[PDB]
Amino acid sequence: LYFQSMRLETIFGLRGRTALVTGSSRGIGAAIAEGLAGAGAHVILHGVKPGSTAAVQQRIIASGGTAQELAGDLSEAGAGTDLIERAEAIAPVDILVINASAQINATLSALTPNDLAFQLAVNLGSTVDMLQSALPKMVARKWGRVVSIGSINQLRPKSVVTAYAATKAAQHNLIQSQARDFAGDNVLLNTLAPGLVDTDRNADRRAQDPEGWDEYVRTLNWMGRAGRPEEMVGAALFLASEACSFMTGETIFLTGGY
Amino acid sequence: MRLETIFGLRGRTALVTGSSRGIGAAIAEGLAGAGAHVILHGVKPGSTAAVQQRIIASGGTAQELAGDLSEAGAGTDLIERAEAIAPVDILVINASAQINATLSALTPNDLAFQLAVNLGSTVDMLQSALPKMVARKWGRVVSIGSINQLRPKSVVTAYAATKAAQHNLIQSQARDFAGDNVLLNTLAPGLVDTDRNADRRAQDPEGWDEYVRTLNWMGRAGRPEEMVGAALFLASEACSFMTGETIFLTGGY
Amino acid sequence: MRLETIFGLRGRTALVTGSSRGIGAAIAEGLAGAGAHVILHGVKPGSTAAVQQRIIASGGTAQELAGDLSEAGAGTDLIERAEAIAPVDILVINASAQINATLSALTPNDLAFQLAVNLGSTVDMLQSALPKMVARKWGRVVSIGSINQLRPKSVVTAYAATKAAQHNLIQSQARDFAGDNVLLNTLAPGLVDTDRNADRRAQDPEGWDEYVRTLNWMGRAGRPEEMVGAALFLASEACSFMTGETIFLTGGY
Amino acid sequence: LYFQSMRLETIFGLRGRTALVTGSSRGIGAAIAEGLAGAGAHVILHGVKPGSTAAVQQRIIASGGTAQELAGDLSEAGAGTDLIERAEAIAPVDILVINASAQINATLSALTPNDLAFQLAVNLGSTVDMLQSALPKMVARKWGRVVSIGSINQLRPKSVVTAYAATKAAQHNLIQSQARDFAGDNVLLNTLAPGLVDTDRNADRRAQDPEGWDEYVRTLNWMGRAGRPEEMVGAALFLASEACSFMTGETIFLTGGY
Ligand SMILES: NC(=O)c1ccc[n+]([C@@H]2O[C@H](COP(=O)([O-])OP(=O)(O)OC[C@H]3O[C@@H](n4cnc5c(N)ncnc54)[C@H](OP(=O)(O)O)[C@@H]3O)[C@@H](O)[C@H]2O)c1
């Protein structure tokens, strides 16, 4: 009962809050989802197909947390709106982690109309839709957290991911304009922008080409290595909790130094 | 080291989107005054007649290509048409769509329209123009950005996000083609007196004066002509060691 | 993935400069609450007695090293003294000097004093501490910066410039020692209620309320305790893939 | 007499203005000084020892411009104040190019008290002093331009130049706080920040080690080359003239892409 101000549970604890984490079936979203549940949030997991989140759900339950799934392809018109509405019908959504994204590599000469539109639909379109449904609901409850997963490419882009990088820049810009609008309602939005992280998106290459991969990562960033998904978790807990009550519209870069 | 030797554009050709009026018009006349042949552009045929007349009157040369940049493939068609007239050395990406709306009033149609013009036609123009510039081993893109690309206000939620994506494209392509002398940079204005705000300005001058007084450190809106020096710098040999960057002309902000 | 497993500091030792009160005091108590042994610091012996008492009262451990960081070599002496007590794993560079003055009222003495504390002692502490941390293959520096390091106001002309230099040191050293797991980052607050502004605040509450209302997007000053989560993040395993960066806690700005 | 608005001479012309360019005996300062005189400014040249600016002065004169020298070591206390006062006794100083700087390479472990203090004295100390004397004088005349020469190291520093980089960050911060104060008086301050440029500071290395140097510059920046001093000139003319009338407190980075 005394000196409560300074405890980890007071600062980062999420008991009584609910988080929706898009693309939490695996990778960074899965790590973040487990971390959030670890701090006490009830977590609504999401993936494209029904049942894709089963393994993460069971890890959350086995660690004494609670979680359930909502599935859906975010490339579909209105999908972001519908996801929020379904999540809200389960419980008030206090925390939204915008993690699922589309990425098709191509330099400008290889960028097709289809690929550009798909990456916009998922990365910008569904983001606009989810914020449009979720933010008024958080504003009405006077508390909200959006943790948008961005990328070092939002700030220093490489043409190998031309379109994706451009959608990540637009996405953070949304986080900024809305943070400015709703800060006074305790509805805060920030971006967590990773550099290179070991996930499925590169699982195959690592396994098939260790020599190359190591020479590449060695001069990519100051640590000379890829990050692990679990290394995103602290920053996500910070951005999802009372701990960031005086921070909004900002980006935390986790790039291994870059 | 005469001004002409630093910023001169004799022998170059520039395409300036949205050069019928406002910032694009001032830029077009500046480029033509530095010696560029200028291809002017606006939505409808004849929209650029006045700027063309002023360029010719001052001893420069110019002609018009019109087209609505919101239509699918319009950027590609525009560059192809301009290239059939002459090598396009300098591309000024100035025309843009802006529909004011906070997030609650942002419709999918309005979002799609702003994307089509601000990002869609930009991608299409660069996809067509950059390879031509690279083969010639010289090129300049001057993308007209906005302070909202960096510190956005929700009153232009969608437009601000498109300007952030557009500058990101400028950076990724700058990084690819710098070794070919094909340079891309953003000129990002703060508030500038144009038609886009003539209506507010005419309509509540006190409300307006009071908003500009505290907007930026100079307490005023910029004039389209104050964009021109910067455009000349980014369009010429002068910026030969500069690429992927942004010049902010915001009155101090 | 318990909070304790992510942010826990059992077995680590932290030195927090200027932990007698304000932001440094809150940070010290937070670190001690996460399990760090904390070495507290203030200008004069006994200045940190209260924070030490609260740490011990909540089950943590702490002790004091005092010293004026404006004196030549003081940063070096401070680190050497702390290292003779235990390995210093975490260095929080919080104490700073701030003498308000616009450029016309900036004296060479005031400039030298702010440089000596804000940059001089920082260089000396890092010069002494970093090699020790590197040899142990783990280290954290949490430099307390300021929004003025990035968007300065002339009312703190000299102080703002020192905070910009200090963050630059953080970045150059981060880049050198990242491969050794010795990480350095800046926590940069906007306006926070401390003693440094208790006097204004007590003295013209309307003038004050009116200035904070429009200062940042939340329209309020932060509390020292709102710095603590961020300090814990930057002081622990949690920031293992983050270095050379800045966390801005400004209320939105 | 018609369409004057759009001419190069109107936009960038400096007839009737006077510029003081520190460290203009050679390198970037010399190129900038000649460019300014080329646009019509009367240029006060500066170097450490009397007569160090003689060759640049004669190039300026031979091209039909005017220039004269003021010499002095900026590491001395009060040197910046005294330089401005001497320049003002020649003519009102409309344009100040803060180009001379001290640079002694050292990582943190090799940084000595003497070297740190010297680099502060020149890069920060004399900068504070010159701005302190010059700005009120420009404010009284309702027109002024400060073009501060910074460095890519002000933003992304390398430890090989630890102290220097830190002084360049502080220096740009001064440019910002003062720009904000005096914008309303048409007294504008901006930073021109070069990346790697061929000057005397590396003249010896280039000449003695061409193979190494070329491999190094090839992956340094996106152009794969060092800049030339004359490539700073356009940006300096822009920042010194009517052309930047709506720009203050900003940095132009000339780094070859970085
Ligand atoms: N990995 C990196 O190096 C890296 C670096 C910087 C930024 N990031 C960003 O971090 C976030 C997560 O990356 P990651 O590497 O963890 O991705 P990942 O492992 O490939 O997983 C992506 C997740 O998003 C979901 N998803 C993908 N496409 C979708 C669609 N059209 N509709 C709905 N859901 C979809 C997937 O669901 P299913 O499991 O059902 O397919 C999956 O759960 C992304 O925003 C990414 O841009 C990653």
Ligand SMILES: NC(=O)c1ccc[n+]([C@@H]2O[C@H](COP(=O)([O-])OP(=O)(O)OC[C@H]3O[C@@H](n4cnc5c(N)ncnc54)[C@H](OP(=O)(O)O)[C@@H]3O)[C@@H](O)[C@H]2O)c1
């Ligand atoms: N004004 C400001 O305060 C401000 C601030 C920051 C950034 N900017 C940026 O500066 C640039 C120019 O702005 P401005 O205020 O000078 O604009 P403006 O006065 O409204 O003129 C816009 C120009 O773009 C053309 N245009 C508009 N929509 C088009 C479409 N769908 N297809 C083809 N052409 C189209 C117009 O052609 P028609 O004449 O045929 O209609 C006109 O020539 C824009 O990129 C804007 O975003 C402006």
Ligand SMILES: NC(=O)c1ccc[n+]([C@@H]2O[C@H](COP(=O)([O-])OP(=O)(O)OC[C@H]3O[C@@H](n4cnc5c(N)ncnc54)[C@H](OP(=O)(O)O)[C@@H]3O)[C@@H](O)[C@H]2O)c1
């Ligand atoms: N408060 C704000 O609004 C704000 C905003 C942005 C950044 N910051 C930064 O946050 C940090 C802490 O600020 P604060 O407002 O909490 O400060 P504060 O309440 O004034 O406390 C300052 C602490 O630093 C110590 N200190 C001051 N001068 C010293 C010297 N010459 N030698 C040794 N120790 C010295 C003091 O020791 P004694 O108790 O012995 O005097 C005290 O413990 C500073 O780096 C400040 O620049 C503050």
Ligand SMILES: NC(=O)c1ccc[n+]([C@@H]2O[C@H](COP(=O)([O-])OP(=O)(O)OC[C@H]3O[C@@H](n4cnc5c(N)ncnc54)[C@H](OP(=O)(O)O)[C@@H]3O)[C@@H](O)[C@H]2O)c1
């Ligand atoms: N070269 C690069 O790659 C590079 C990159 C980024 C930034 N910069 C910056 O650009 C500016 C010019 O660089 P540079 O390479 O042209 O330098 P430089 O060729 O070595 O010449 C420096 C000039 O400054 C003067 N100077 C040096 N120390 C001085 C002192 N203590 N007091 C008074 N004057 C002094 C010198 O006068 P004397 O001739 O009498 O010695 C000389 O005219 C500097 O601010 C530098 O930091 C350069």
